[PDB]
Amino acid sequence: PMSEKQLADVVERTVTPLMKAQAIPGMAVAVIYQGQPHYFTFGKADVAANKPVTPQTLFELGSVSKTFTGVLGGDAIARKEISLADPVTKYWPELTGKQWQGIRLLDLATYTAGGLPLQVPDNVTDNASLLRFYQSWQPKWAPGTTRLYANTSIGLFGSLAVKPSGMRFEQAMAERVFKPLKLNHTWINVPHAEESHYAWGYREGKAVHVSPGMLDAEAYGVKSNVKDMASWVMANMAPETLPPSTLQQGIALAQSRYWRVGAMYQGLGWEMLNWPVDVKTVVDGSDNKVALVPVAEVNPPAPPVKASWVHKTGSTGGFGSYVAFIPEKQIGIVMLANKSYPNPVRVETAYRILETL
Template sequence: MRKVTPSGLGFFTLACLSLGASAQAAESEAALKRTVDEAIRPVMEKNGVPGMAVAVTAGGKHYFFNYGVASKESGQKVSENTIFEIGSISKTFTGTLGAYAEAQGKLSLADKASKYWPALAGSSFDTIPLLDLGTYTAGGLPLQFPDGVTTREKMLAYYRNWQPAYPTGTHRQYSNPSIGLFGYLAARSMDAPYDTLMEKKLLPMLGLTGTYAKVPEARMGDYAYGYSKANKPIRVNPGFMASEMYGVKTTAADFIKFVDDNIDPSKLDPVMQKAIASTHTGYYRIGPMTQGLGWELYPYPVTLDQLLDGNSTDMARKANKAEKLTPPQPARKELFINKTGSTNGFGAYAAFVPAKDIGVVILANKAYPNAERVKAGYRILQALEGQN
């Protein structure tokens, strides 16, 4: 058989095609940079944000865009390896750990809360399922613990004495004590402290090496300072169940890997794949948004107005009527999935669309309005969708 080889003209044509593809890729990346710049720089200027790190994933490829400083005092520049506090986006890890415990058979979301903490026996939590703690539908647990809850004993007393304002499963009231207790009980079902499970099991299984419940000494030089409303440097002061509620710290480079895990979990352990699917399952519908475990879900395509409604102050601060989905809405690719998070000195946003294989993470060392995060993220994802 005669071996057929490309002609010189064929090589030339292939080379031209290769150069053309490279030029097109460079042009697309330049266009993406312009979009990110136009979305982020005005937000920084308007809100006095010292530094921001943006990570984008498209088809599994990552792009990083860094702005400003991690510390105004030292002048250290932001990079994709700068560590930011992500506030309530920490709840997506809490949801994942609880879902992993269920996938392992350690708990059922239908189990009553007091099953995993006998000290709650005889309280309202004898009748409240774990699912309703994880989806903020237990009956009106508040946004934060009352100021008087200053010790573990007082925390237990608070839970034991708490009485629902609404029948379980009828209203969603966004609540740190609700999902905090969910994460705490999930950890108890696995016979280990939450932080230990996070750092020794969950994060390694997800391939995350720059995400922490507590930043190790060796990485403190990469830990940004947040800035308060008075523009004073500040970092989170961990309280009870901090990691479960708001205490995770991460980098843009690491967190975008978690977004990839959520877009396509097929490379993960089968049990973790099942857990990820559970966090994308719709359990309650509240207006335009459907509540998953940690993540908040919207049918795709979604309008900006729907996202702004779902991420509004009323959604975060008030009790809203919730429609229980029976059976729950199975995880699917045609979703827009997002979560905001803040501490006193940081503001964060993450969003992704599995069907389009695109996602964005926006980390800032100053809190600023959720609406502005959502608008910036939506604009960036729309640009990515146009390129795909």
């Protein structure tokens, strides 16, 4: 096995020229290895204030937020509050258009509703406008037959999934996921008292934070530090070490396989490829195309496979995050950056580091 000094050398030798070439001001990395987290921090959380990245620095996770949404949805299924087979109209009866009749919660959760678009329009700012948005939408394909990665899809899934609980999405997430896992520095809204930890993101050299939008918490709005994200990876990689609960059950539901596109399998938030897999296949299987693609159905959903590469990418205007783990090998990695850089490069960097273990 690799010593702490040897592992630190591996991470530094890769991250340092990456940050220079990409102009990434700061990065926090966690490697999960031999049951332990290993933290490495580089550069600046706030360039203008000359503030370094630390293990307490908060980064915007962007679409990595969807892994929390998927597990919270799985927890709601285990609580028998929702079923993925249920019609969307069971939870939003005001959605009366004929195009919605055959669409299920499963389709929202896994991007198979038939072409829901990538973003909620910025001018949709209240519930009446959100209703008009989904009422107006015209599908391109029958549900359960195509994939189009979309915040409007899993974002609405997250919002409807917590409806039977009576809680706001943020409340449900804190009470049912964050608190039981002791993710005490993971936030949908960064409290005033925690702002000193909040890194700035950088786009074209300008400091930026993610803008508020409808369904943001569900799709791209979580902020966290490298220690909480290591704990998140550890909980999803080794949920059998948790006490029995609906949350443990929900973690399994989120890593179940619902659809296949090429070599990638769609979970709830999480995406998976069968292990062993070459790095080029992981890169090819983690491009969310602008265009729709057909899917192959996994019916019934397949339970979690320990021999999987499990991962999720995420970005905001100013941040780029990545998490990946292999349960069969009990290794995993978190990479948090305050500049967005290409997803294939995140995969390549992570894959190379995990290979050394």
